[PDB]
Nucleic acid binder design. Structure first.
Ligand SMILES: [Mg+2]
Length: 577
DNA sequence: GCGATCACGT
DNA sequence: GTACGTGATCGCA
């Protein structure tokens, strides 16, 4: 049982408690808090939020760093409270982040899923209480209060076992000194938001719509027929079958119309290049322009992303609504969408800094490959140097296609691509792709040793780790299915690289946030995507940031090779280049 | 409301 | 068969 309280009492405000501040809406920005539960040494309490959040003693307790709180996904509560003008401090244990560090593959999305990891089942899944989809609804207070109280009781009971296993894993500091402090920095970033120039966005959409009408009219002209170009089925009817173009690749059900396949079909009919153009502009328009305009808050003309800190299996952050990482880094209209992201105040500017080749630099360090480390200590062009070694040619002898092929081999390492995906990448056979890989290993024998050694370690221990002791379990590394084992092998190889890079960027964000406040700068972190950190700041702060930000980022950790940072600033995210 | 297909990132 | 994740569109029960 528990106290369904009508008012806040002093025994509810002890200096250690499990706390539940429930936000049912998936997007928690400016969203309702439907109820509150507190479990501490004196009992179990349910508080109605309209009551507790107006109580000065309760508000002071929430904001008191010395009053320690154990929670699940504290960033959600922290942000929903920020929109109410209330500060949450003193969160000493976050069970979502603890379960994520223990085993990111579990997919722990609620208290019940984390509780099940330690045989605790006296709590329901959130989906059982609130329902999913069209049926989703807050239940009546008796059902709601029991659920919130059981979640707090579970949290109270699970802190010690989770912390104990974290300590056995040497992940206790990872949680306490990296993920939890980062959680709060993300909260501030999400709350601050990023100003969007919606008039510029609507202009680009208008530009695209006119271009799409032009190309679409041309496609119907060449097809001799109207159809939904956006329907891969109707389009497969028209390309193959009608226009008799070869079928070079099949889909599980019908005709494949992938971009990779269409480019090879272009020499046969003028429609293909226009189909390719329609899909380019179509995805910019439909996914990015219209997608971004939907998530801009009209009150403040900002987008307020949500970072999922406990999702990837590498430790990389991910973000949604909007996912600004997914914005293209390529075309002279994809990356230009970044012109719509502007400073939120007059006479402020965007400052953007990004790690240069951090993954390959991490690989140099972990593998202690002599040639790769010397390349970075010389600050070489890594793709040019790789081409020199693979093709045994001098720097002036490297042609553009040689550099492209070396860069594709390096890209394969950074993202853990199979030789078939390298072959697919380079439009070459798997045999040729394999001999490319072998020549790489001849020039970087330390990388080869690392790749053999890490697979063997994964087989022996069951998992691999990153620089700051993140882990990834790889049960499929034993599989007799070739493709399943091969993927686990590539994840054994890739996760210490990508995940250690994630570690460094997170530590950099923490280090930078501390330095900015030490320095009493108004500059603020706004986004972290790819290997980049984006800030905004008064224009009067740019010269100081030009020294401060790269220094903090370069010194976040000390590797056997230097860390290199490129930095720019400008009037938009695009112009910070 | 799900698979399935595509295109973006990892 | 030969790469998972995000998110949009279009298909089908
Ligand atoms: Mg990246």
């Amino acid at each position: 049982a528990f106290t369904l309280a009508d008012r806040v009492t002093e025994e509810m405000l002890a200096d250690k408690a499990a706390l539940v501040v429930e936000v049912v809406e998936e997007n928690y920005h400016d969203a309702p808090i439907v109820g509150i539960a507190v479990v501490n040494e004196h009992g179990r309490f349910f508080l109605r939020p309209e009551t507790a959040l107006a109580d000065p003693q309760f508000v002071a307790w929430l904001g008191d760093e010395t009053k320690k709180k154990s929670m699940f996904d504290s960033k959600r509560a922290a942000v929903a409270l920020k929109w109410k003008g209330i500060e949450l401090c003193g969160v000493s244990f976050d069970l979502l982040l603890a379960a994520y560090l223990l085993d990111p593959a579990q997919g722990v999305d609620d208290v019940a899923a984390a509780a099940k990891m330690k045989q605790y089942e006296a709590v329901r899944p959130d989906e059982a209480v609130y329902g999913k989809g069209a049926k989703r609804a807050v239940p009546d207070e008796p059902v709601l209060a029991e659920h919130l109280v059981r979640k707090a009781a579970a949290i109270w009971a699970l802190e010690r076992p989770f912390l104990d296993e974290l300590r056995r894993n040497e992940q206790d500091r990872l949680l306490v000194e990296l993920e939890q402090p980062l959680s709060s920095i993300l909260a501030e970033m999400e709350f601050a938001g990023v100003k969007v120039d919606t008039k510029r966005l609507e202009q680009m959409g208008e530009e695209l719509a006119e271009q799409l009408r032009t190309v679409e009219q041309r496609i119907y002209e060449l097809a001799g027929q109207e159809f939904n170009i956006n329907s891969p089925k109707q389009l497969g009817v028209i390309l193959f079958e009608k226009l008799q173009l070869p079928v070079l690749k099949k889909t599980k059900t019908g005709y494949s119309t992938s971009a990779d396949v269409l480019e090879k079909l272009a020499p046969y009919h003028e429609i293909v290049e226009n189909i390719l153009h329609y899909r380019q502009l179509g995805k910019l328009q439909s996914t990015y322009i219209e997608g971004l305009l939907k998530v801009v808050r009209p009150d403040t003309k900002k987008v307020h992303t949500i970072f999922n800190q406990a999702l990837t299996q590498t430790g990389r952050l991910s973000s949604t609504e909007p996912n600004l990482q997914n914005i293209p880094i390529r075309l002279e209209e994809g990356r230009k969408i970044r012109q719509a992201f502007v400073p939120s105040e007059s006479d402020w500017l965007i400052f953007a800094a990004d790690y240069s080749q951090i993954e390959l630099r991490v690989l140099a360090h972990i593998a202690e490959d002599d040639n790769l480390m010397e390349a970075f200590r010389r600050d070489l062009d890594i793709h040019t140097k790789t081409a020199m070694d693979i093709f045994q040619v001098s720097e002036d002898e490297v042609t553009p296609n040689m550099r492209r092929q070396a860069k594709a081999v390096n890209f394969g390492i950074v993202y853990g691509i199979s030789d078939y995906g390298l072959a697919q990448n380079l439009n070459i056979s798997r045999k040729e792709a394999a001999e490319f890989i072998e020549r790489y290993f001849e020039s970087f024998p330390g990388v080869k040793r690392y790749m053999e050694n890490i697979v063997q370690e994964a087989k022996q221990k069951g998992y691999v780790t990153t620089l700051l002791h993140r882990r990834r379990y790889l049960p499929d590394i034993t599989s007799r299915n070739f493709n399943v084992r091969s993927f686990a092998e590539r994840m054994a190889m890739n996760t210490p690289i990508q995940g250690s890079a994630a570690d460094i960027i997170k530590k950099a964000m923490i280090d930078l946030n501390a330095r900015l406040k030490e320095e009493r700068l108004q500059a603020r972190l706004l986004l972290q995507v790819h290997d980049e950190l984006i800030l905004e700041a008064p224009k009067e702060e740019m010269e100081r940031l030009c020294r401060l930000v790269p220094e903090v980022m370069e010194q976040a950790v000390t590797l056997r090779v230097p860390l290199k940072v490129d930095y720019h600033y400008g009037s938009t995210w695009y112009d910070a280049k």
